[PDB]
Amino acid sequence: QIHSRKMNVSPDVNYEELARCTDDFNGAQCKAVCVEAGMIALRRGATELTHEDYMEGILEVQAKKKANLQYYA
Amino acid sequence: MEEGGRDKTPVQSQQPSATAPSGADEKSSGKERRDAGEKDKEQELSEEDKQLQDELEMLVERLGEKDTSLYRPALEELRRQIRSSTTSMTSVPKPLKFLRPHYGKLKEIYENMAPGENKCFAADIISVLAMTMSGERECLKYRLVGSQEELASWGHEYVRHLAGEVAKEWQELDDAEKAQREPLLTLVKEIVPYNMAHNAEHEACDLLMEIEQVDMLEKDIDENAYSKVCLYLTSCVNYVPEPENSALLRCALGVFRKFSRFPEALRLALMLNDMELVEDIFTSCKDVVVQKQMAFMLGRHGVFLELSEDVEEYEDLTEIMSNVQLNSNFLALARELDIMEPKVPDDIYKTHLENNRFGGSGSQVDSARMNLASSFVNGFVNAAFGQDKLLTDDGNKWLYKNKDHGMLSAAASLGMILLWDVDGGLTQIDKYLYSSEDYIKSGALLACGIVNSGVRNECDPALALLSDYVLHNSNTMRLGSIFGLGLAYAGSNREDVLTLLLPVMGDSKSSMEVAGVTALACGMIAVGSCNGDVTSTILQTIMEKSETELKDTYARWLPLGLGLNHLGKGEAIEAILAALEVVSEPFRSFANTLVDVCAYAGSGNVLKVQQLLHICSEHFDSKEKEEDKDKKEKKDKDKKEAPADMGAHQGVAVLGIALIAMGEEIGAEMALRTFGHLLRYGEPTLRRAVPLALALISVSNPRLNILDTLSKFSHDADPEVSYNSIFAMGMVGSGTNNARLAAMLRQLAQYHAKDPNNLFMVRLAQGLTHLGKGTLTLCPYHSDRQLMSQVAVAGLLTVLVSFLDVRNIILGKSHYVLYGLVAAMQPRMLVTFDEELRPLPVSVRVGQAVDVVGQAGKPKTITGFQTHTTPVLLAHGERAELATEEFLPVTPILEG
Amino acid sequence: TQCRLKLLKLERIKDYLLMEEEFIRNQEQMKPLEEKQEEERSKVDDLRGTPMSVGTLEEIIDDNHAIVSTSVGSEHYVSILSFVDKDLLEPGCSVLLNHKVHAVIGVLMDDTDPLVTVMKVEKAPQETYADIGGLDNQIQEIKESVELPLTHPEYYEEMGIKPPKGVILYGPPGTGKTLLAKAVANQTSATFLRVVGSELIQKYLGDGPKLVRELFRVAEEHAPSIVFIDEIDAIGTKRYDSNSGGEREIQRTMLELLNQLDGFDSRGDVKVIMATNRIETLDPALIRPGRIDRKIEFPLPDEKTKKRIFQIHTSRMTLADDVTLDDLIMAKDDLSGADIKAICTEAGLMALRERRMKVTNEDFKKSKENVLYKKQEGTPEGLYL
Amino acid sequence: QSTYSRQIKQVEDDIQQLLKKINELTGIKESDTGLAPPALWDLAADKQTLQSEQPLQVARCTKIINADSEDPKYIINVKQFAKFVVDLSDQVAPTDIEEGMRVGVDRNKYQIHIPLPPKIDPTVTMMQVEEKPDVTYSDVGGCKEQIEKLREVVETPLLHPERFVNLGIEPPKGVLLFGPPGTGKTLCARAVANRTDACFIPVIGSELVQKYVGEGARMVRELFEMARTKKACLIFFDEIDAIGGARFDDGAGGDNEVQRTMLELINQLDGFDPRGNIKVLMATNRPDTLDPALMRPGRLDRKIEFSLPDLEGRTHIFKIHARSMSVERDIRFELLARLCPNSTGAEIRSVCTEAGMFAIRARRKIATEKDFLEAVNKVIKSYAKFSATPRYMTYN
Amino acid sequence: DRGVNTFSPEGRLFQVEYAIEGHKLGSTAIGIQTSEGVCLAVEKRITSPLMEPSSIEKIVEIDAHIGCAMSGLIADAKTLIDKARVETQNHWFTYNETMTVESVTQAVSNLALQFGEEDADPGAMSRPFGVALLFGGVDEKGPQLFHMDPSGTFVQCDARAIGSASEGAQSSLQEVYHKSTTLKEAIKSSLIILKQVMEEKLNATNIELATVQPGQNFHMFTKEELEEVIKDI
Amino acid sequence: ELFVMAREHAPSIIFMDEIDSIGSSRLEGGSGGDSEVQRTMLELLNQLDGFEATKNIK
């Protein structure tokens, strides 16, 4: 709620809403995903945020070395 | 050794076979030597053929190994055998065959021993052998390039052979086109460009260009190899005199203008000094390559790139001539015409002012020597063109207040500050031209010459305005007008400019003493083009010296003009000389002597020899004194020769001052004073050291005026690195105060050096190569030898007018902005094999914006991996563009 | 080619003659060099005087000052003396300071350390090239990697790759891995620096990575170079527990060599030939492809390769018909190059015990037993075969 | 010509004889003078010589307590570690010297002329530093998926903080780059560094460890701070298991010297202060040695794993490398890469390098099929077993 | 140290990640399913033609109406196929219908991953398979081709290629094959791709061909028919 | 550096000592601290200058 005032946050998903499906996460984690979600959006050239920017955000935190979710389909 | 291998049938002998030609073979050595002579050819012909195949095979096997112990003695022993009598005499087919591996054997010796003797000997054998074999050398090289393996050693060896052909010791045109040079250029860029440069093999490369462009693009750097051929060619003056090289540069210039890489062509036209050549460089690019691309564009772009001296377009031989060819070139008549007009190159300079800011803090303060001091200072802070506009607009303080010669001096320096205005500076000069005494109007005229060059290109010319002005009955106004004329044209050949010089200063009887500068202005037009050949300048100088040599200023200027009018050519001087003889005096005998020196001048070894038989260290009265300093400088020559010869010139420049001091004691003070300008003309490879060393000492020695001369070069690259140097100089000047007269010279020095940040640097180089000519450096250069420089002479001396244009980035596909554009930097350099000195187009990405520099900027290149392209204009940013040539007619490299 | 030699010569003639001409002539005529030229010579010479303290130039500061640390136990932020240049003091070189008031009089010394002396090793070997027989293929591989880009770097850097560097020498130990680096080094004519991998970890704390920097820096300056690093296998195999630097020391050393090699440094002309036992006992940080393009695995030396090496040693040894080469080679199995060397060295030694200066078939037969046991020993192996 | 040749041999003796006259005038050896910049500097220089400004002894000011007898005094502790109470030489004000700031004092007359620049005491760290290097962009594989992810965090605030404030997003801090040797943590970092065109200081931690415990720690804090002050700085910390190792002791050894420095780095990145907009990148050789303080978001917002370059990455490294090279184009560059097993980035490139070498060896203007097959069959067998990755990956 | 049985910091298993790259060292499997049969082409993976083609097996009959071609780590594959033969046959035996290609595929996919150095014994795995199989056969519904990979994903395929470059083998398919096409083109479309995915030549001793078709069992191509198909590129 | 200096005062003996009661805390791991010193010395000693076929430092 404090964060939404400063930068845009999508109707589609809020970190609170996101947490329910997943599990618990720490407060630094919640702000970091959020800044990162904006980062994709800034890069595109939009001030608006989408749901994809946040989901991409979870993926941005994880490690990668074979980048495939069609083997982990 | 290990006898037998191939002359033995068992399975085992294959190992000794590689080794064996080092000591001796059973029959294989003998096949070419013993067996061929002793027996008759036809009986022998069956055996030799079988064995021939096996020697070929051994060559391939030796390349398989990496060892030199097995490579070198093995091929050497085989040679001797071939030489004896399988050279041309066996038959029609058999000599072609024997000759094919013979070439291979030869390369290693040619390449390895470097000496002059070895060099000539190999050419003798190679040429006769080439003719008989008739083209087998070409297949041989190509097979070797393919191979399966070879040695690193061999890489150097195969190119070296191409040099035997170029000499033509037994050739004259038969196999004087390729030894398969093309793959050979690609692999290695080293010995092969020298061979090409001398042969005139360089013609074939245009036909080959279509294939080569792929390799030049992203795969290799074939581009480096051709730029090298050009280095060797210009260097050839130093190697062997100017008359010998002159024929050569003409044939080299035609192949390069036809080639896609335009800067190389541009350098050579600039050296020859001819009207015909310039129009061809402009037109040829467009015609050879019909595709729009860069090709149409390269003609204009090369003229803008050319930076040697003066204002827009610079040389200005080229500006008049490129019209008529303009209509034919047809990118569009309306647009091409507008780009060529100096009105478009003026606008961009306006933007650079903003960046530079005010530097002005100088005196404009009234009364005394300070009023005279003020006028030179206002320009000197913002040298070339900067934000000095406020001060220039203000008429009242500086211009009007001066008295006598001071008024002419005040007006004359004004034009140089107003430099590169279409108009609005012209409004300003015209307003003075009408007002006040004769001194204001005449002074106004040099200044007029400067601003009006802005609207030209054969529509409303600079010539048009100046033509009315010259007519003036008063000596002073007419002088200032011709001086103004000379300044605009710089070094051109044109019917009108020559015609205005023909009657003017038709007497040695003149009221003022600055009448002599007429002769200089005329002298300037002659160099940097086809000579002026004006009668007034030649005839008058001998009469002037006979009435008077009492005025040190007057006496000096007329023979200085004579020595410059003759420069540019040897041939032309003969017509004017022929006239002079009609009037005979003792004075004339000396005039004649100067013509010998003038024709011979610019040679790399002739000129040097002449200086034992000198006109320094002699006075015949004081006749000898006037030109003796001029000879010693060799200043044209120093600029003219390659980047490689600059390293040498740094000693030469100093050497010439030393020479004057030794010869003539009085001449010693003068020599030091010339020095500051000598370096300015020279634009040496390393600029930092020389002026600073001089700068401190020049306070102690009589005539503080040396220090003023020093300051012109001394600021070097404008303050980033120079911040320490410009601050220290200014302090040395300001620190010592002993008189108002001394203060003023030192005050000129302080203020010149002290230039605000990011400003146009001291240059007469091209900004790819330190190649060029100077006929604008000449206007101070001449007046820096006048014994105890007057107020009147100071005025002539003040103008810069030669410094950089702000655009050092894309001209491209029609851009002409200062607005940023990306560039690539190579942290890992390989190249020192490009004359211009641009490292690989494989690129690592970095940010936008290349702005004026003097020295450095060599690793700075333009990206050519972002969408894969190769630079036509070899990029450094000094006055080198970040522009590329690709198939497409629009830059795939988009503005940052 | 010849014409070029004249151009190069052209710069150099002017440099000696000009310096000579100017110094003497210009003090004589007017006031150019004159009072100023004497003044620099004299002032520096007087200030320097007796004594001068030696210091080392740590850093140069842009404001006519420098950080010199002096060999008197005090550091100084000196002021430059009139007529001495700040920018002629190399960070490689130590500078001389006047010891009364600290200002840089000048550089008469660059000074020297025992630290330099380790990296620089001069080779003039008893066995060299054409003193090795057999295993001919293995030498050709080394050369394509080391010799060919080092001699002619121009194509190799130009094509787009970084130049292929070095070789890794592994397989059965004893093949003659050490002889090979020294022999190839003479042919290429590269400055041969030898430094042990175990020598880099030592008691001293923080000296360990500094030394590795020096090893690379010196190799680079020398110009064509090969660094043969003998027994590098050593850092990995042992966690020494005898250094006060500890496990910390081993870590920090291991990274620095990687940094100096390529890294962000990306030094060129420096080939490293690595001698190891095996590269399966070597540390996994160090090993990785693409710093060393080619790896060579020697086969077990056969009976055939062995004869050629022995003929050379027989030539170096006392000559007789009592030298019986074949018998010793045959008896032995498919085993190292080293043994051929060991049989010859033990045979001479053995002679001295007898009070004989002769090396005969008897010394050799006795030598065969000891060499064979020590190296690998055939009587275990005969059961398994 | 013959005359000219004689001079080649001669010039060497001629320079040696002349050598005392060269030395005085140009520089080095007897009477070192440059003649070009110390000449210009000479008038300013005379002021310093006259004064006791030589010596001006290395020190740092502890506290600026003024006291009586000579009024303007400062309490200084020299870098060799003993304190002097000193005086002010008139040439600056007492304002110029400030507590904690580096200052110059004489040794013969103890007094401040000009204060010494603060915090530039490491020379060792500077040794390694090359600003903006990179082998060439072509070996990278150009734009990989790996490069693009790295730019969002890294490039973008340095280039424009304006866009960050506008949207209202906090600016990032840390990117942790990890993988066993040769997966290119440093190669990618150099590529982004050049692009952003921020000043670039990369440093190995192994020189910010020196002498005993605590000296290395002083070097790390001062360096970091200095960079932080500087607007638009990018610091790529190269290979830290030398200021980045495990935290323990067992009381038969101890990791301490390493941990003092590591902890000093970690502390400094965000700070106990909000954060700056100056970026830190850490390259680590183990993901197994890291303590949680380093891992917190705002000193490490997203973890990016450059370990064993991705499925897309293996083919891009070969083709972009192949593009640059003169090679055959009837072979599928991707087939050669695909053959490569579990390839580290260094390993993919190893094929290209070995392939090209054979081609150079021949001296062809391309390459042939044979050069590629010998290279690739060799790489799959031997190199892969002998990579960094089998041993390291299981551990990690 | 920790296992290969542990998760990576990516949140994916270490051992499964390694297995796919392992496939790429070896043989290829190309199966094209047409409505006139399912064809399997696989490389014998030779060093010389002087290697008898009398009884090199890598396309083996699972059932007499289902064939299987293998790709990847060839050694690991030999035991997976031998095993696959008994389980399909237990199913054939009980149901007494002609087995469906999809039932054989699902059954073998759970055996791929049972790995672990705990909760496993000698008959269970301690490593994941890195064998990707192509099961091709004709059933009651008609011709079907199924792809199995180490992650157990089973999918219906009309053309699937996996090989030495898995990626490589597939990119060529798009280019040559088109949905509805004859049997004779289907065999040919495999020989053109086969080369692309191999780094090795077209020899009759280096390719192996088998067709399973309506009303017709798994057939092994002989030297003459191996040549007919080599001719068709 | 030691070999050189030892050469100046030739013949010399570099001595290495184990008794395993002094330096008993340097016997583990690498298996003797004295062993590292030996390994390094012999290897450089093997070839430097013309000193492989001459010996005066043991």
XYZ file of N, CA and C in Angstrom, chain D residues 180-247:
204
model
N 30.926 -21.604 -11.568
C 32.299 -22.126 -11.507
C 33.191 -21.375 -12.558
N 34.458 -21.460 -12.563
C 35.288 -20.737 -13.496
C 34.985 -20.922 -14.919
N 34.807 -19.837 -15.679
C 34.731 -19.859 -17.088
C 33.357 -19.822 -17.621
N 32.394 -19.462 -16.820
C 31.066 -19.238 -17.275
C 30.909 -17.725 -17.578
N 32.067 -16.991 -17.527
C 32.001 -15.626 -17.960
C 31.291 -14.642 -17.057
N 31.501 -14.611 -15.711
C 30.936 -13.575 -14.860
C 31.552 -12.174 -15.202
N 32.926 -12.127 -15.378
C 33.665 -10.987 -15.737
C 33.453 -10.460 -17.187
N 33.280 -11.449 -18.190
C 33.139 -11.127 -19.591
C 31.881 -10.326 -19.797
N 30.699 -10.762 -19.199
C 29.458 -10.031 -19.347
C 29.375 -8.632 -18.719
N 29.993 -8.489 -17.497
C 30.172 -7.333 -16.714
C 30.967 -6.382 -17.451
N 32.053 -6.774 -18.163
C 32.818 -5.809 -18.993
C 31.996 -5.240 -20.159
N 31.161 -6.165 -20.828
C 30.346 -5.740 -21.875
C 29.321 -4.721 -21.519
N 28.603 -4.857 -20.363
C 27.651 -3.871 -19.917
C 28.256 -2.580 -19.475
N 29.493 -2.634 -18.924
C 30.265 -1.513 -18.438
C 30.516 -0.552 -19.560
N 30.944 -1.043 -20.720
C 31.294 -0.261 -21.892
C 30.126 0.376 -22.461
N 29.000 -0.385 -22.515
C 27.769 0.134 -23.055
C 27.212 1.319 -22.316
N 27.168 1.205 -20.918
C 26.561 2.241 -20.096
C 27.413 3.493 -20.225
N 28.746 3.240 -20.367
C 29.762 4.230 -20.423
C 29.749 4.981 -19.114
N 29.772 4.267 -17.986
C 30.098 4.840 -16.621
C 31.549 4.567 -16.395
N 32.267 5.355 -15.565
C 33.683 5.011 -15.282
C 33.727 3.665 -14.563
N 34.763 2.883 -14.919
C 34.787 1.486 -14.591
C 36.058 1.208 -13.833
N 35.917 0.729 -12.616
C 37.002 0.278 -11.795
C 36.645 -1.153 -11.561
N 37.384 -2.141 -12.159
C 37.317 -3.505 -11.666
C 38.539 -3.773 -10.798
N 38.426 -4.650 -9.779
C 39.552 -4.849 -8.868
C 39.469 -6.269 -8.395
N 40.629 -6.940 -8.230
C 40.701 -8.218 -7.544
C 40.931 -7.966 -6.122
N 40.159 -8.723 -5.253
C 40.117 -8.620 -3.797
C 41.379 -9.103 -3.200
N 42.141 -9.953 -4.000
C 43.351 -10.525 -3.534
C 44.450 -9.518 -3.246
N 44.457 -8.301 -3.864
C 45.322 -7.152 -3.526
C 44.647 -6.294 -2.408
N 43.339 -6.317 -2.164
C 42.710 -5.631 -0.985
C 42.844 -6.580 0.222
N 43.682 -7.623 0.149
C 44.151 -8.405 1.222
C 45.714 -8.277 1.072
N 46.352 -7.885 2.139
C 47.788 -7.458 2.129
C 48.172 -7.276 3.572
N 49.467 -7.576 3.850
C 50.108 -7.515 5.181
C 49.215 -8.366 6.087
N 49.050 -7.908 7.387
C 48.202 -8.503 8.361
C 46.802 -7.996 8.341
N 45.933 -8.567 9.264
C 44.553 -8.358 9.568
C 44.348 -6.941 9.902
N 43.494 -6.240 9.123
C 43.048 -4.883 9.398
C 43.571 -3.881 8.427
N 44.769 -4.069 7.847
C 45.302 -3.240 6.793
C 44.578 -3.445 5.540
N 44.154 -4.633 5.159
C 43.433 -4.882 3.987
C 42.036 -4.248 4.038
N 41.450 -4.247 5.260
C 40.129 -3.698 5.628
C 39.991 -2.163 5.458
N 41.112 -1.465 5.803
C 41.227 -0.037 5.598
C 41.139 0.299 4.091
N 41.791 -0.515 3.219
C 41.839 -0.364 1.809
C 40.448 -0.481 1.142
N 39.624 -1.505 1.539
C 38.325 -1.792 1.052
C 37.342 -0.681 1.367
N 37.379 -0.119 2.639
C 36.390 0.926 3.025
C 36.697 2.144 2.272
N 38.007 2.607 2.178
C 38.332 3.812 1.548
C 38.094 3.801 0.090
N 38.382 2.676 -0.555
C 38.086 2.554 -1.959
C 36.639 2.645 -2.306
N 35.834 1.951 -1.418
C 34.415 1.869 -1.738
C 33.669 3.222 -1.672
N 34.050 3.991 -0.656
C 33.544 5.273 -0.298
C 33.854 6.213 -1.386
N 35.057 6.113 -1.861
C 35.542 7.002 -2.881
C 34.741 6.867 -4.174
N 34.449 5.618 -4.517
C 33.626 5.303 -5.646
C 32.162 5.816 -5.447
N 31.681 5.629 -4.221
C 30.290 6.004 -3.851
C 30.018 7.462 -4.024
N 31.082 8.288 -3.688
C 31.064 9.791 -3.769
C 30.889 10.171 -5.214
N 31.698 9.463 -6.036
C 31.761 9.641 -7.500
C 30.425 9.317 -8.092
N 29.807 10.237 -8.901
C 28.476 10.114 -9.570
C 28.630 9.208 -10.768
N 27.798 8.217 -11.006
C 27.803 7.287 -12.107
C 29.094 6.455 -12.107
N 29.320 5.713 -10.993
C 30.386 4.738 -10.912
C 29.831 3.325 -10.993
N 30.474 2.444 -11.707
C 30.189 1.044 -11.813
C 31.456 0.329 -11.244
N 31.265 -0.518 -10.188
C 32.357 -1.336 -9.626
C 32.049 -2.790 -9.885
N 32.945 -3.554 -10.586
C 32.748 -4.929 -10.846
C 33.774 -5.506 -9.921
N 33.395 -6.306 -8.875
C 34.312 -6.835 -7.931
C 34.627 -8.206 -8.621
N 35.916 -8.466 -9.080
C 36.293 -9.617 -9.843
C 36.717 -10.714 -8.780
N 36.273 -11.936 -9.041
C 36.584 -13.147 -8.318
C 36.793 -12.956 -6.840
N 35.747 -13.013 -6.041
C 35.993 -12.887 -4.531
C 35.643 -14.237 -3.902
N 36.715 -15.060 -3.607
C 36.850 -16.023 -2.595
C 38.108 -15.606 -1.833
N 38.461 -14.259 -1.935
C 39.634 -13.756 -1.349
C 39.155 -12.526 -0.459
N 37.803 -12.304 -0.176
C 37.096 -11.251 0.466
C 35.660 -11.597 0.267
N 35.361 -12.905 0.539
C 34.114 -13.468 0.058
C 34.061 -14.893 0.482
N 35.082 -15.467 1.204
C 35.074 -16.861 1.653
C 34.124 -17.157 2.872
N 34.135 -18.465 3.288
C 33.335 -18.906 4.447
C 33.711 -18.209 5.753
N 32.698 -18.162 6.697
C 32.823 -17.599 8.015
C 32.877 -18.652 9.071
